[PDB]
Amino acid sequence: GSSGSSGTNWASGEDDHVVARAEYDFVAVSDEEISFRAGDMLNLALKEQQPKVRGWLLASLDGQTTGLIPANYVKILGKRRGRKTIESGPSSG
């Protein structure tokens, strides 16, 4: 079929998301899953958005398409906040 969605642009970075680097290699068992190798940056959506499934975190390897990716297989480096927030308004020291 076709696709199309706005707002939640965490995958692109415009929205709040997390950063992680695949610790090892792992392919996609199904179409829903994504194939990534050790050394890729995957954007993980906040639990709020995350699906019901447990263990698998919803993230977009490339940035446009989102799929189910493993956690242990990936290592978190340092979550980041939305992009707009960048030089948007005032903030404490």
UniProtKB/Swiss-Prot annotation:
Compartment(s) where it occurs, according to its Swiss-Prot or TrEMBL record: Peroxisome membrane
Domain SH3 residue range list: 15-79
Superkingdom of the organism of origin: Eukaryota
Signal peptide: none
Similarity remark: Belongs to the peroxin-13 family.
Subunit structure, as described in the record: Interacts (via SH3 domain) with PEX14 (via SH3-binding motif); forming the PEX13-PEX14 docking complex. Interacts with PEX19.
Biological role stated in the UniProt entry: Component of the PEX13-PEX14 docking complex, a translocon channel that specifically mediates the import of peroxisomal cargo proteins bound to PEX5 receptor. The PEX13-PEX14 docking complex forms a large import pore which can be opened to a diameter of about 9 nm. Mechanistically, PEX5 receptor along with cargo proteins associates with the PEX14 subunit of the PEX13-PEX14 docking complex in the cytosol, leading to the insertion of the receptor into the organelle membrane with the concomitant translocation of the cargo into the peroxisome matrix.
Stated name of the protein: Peroxisomal membrane protein PEX13
Species in which this protein is naturally found: Mus musculus
Gene designation per UniProt: Pex13
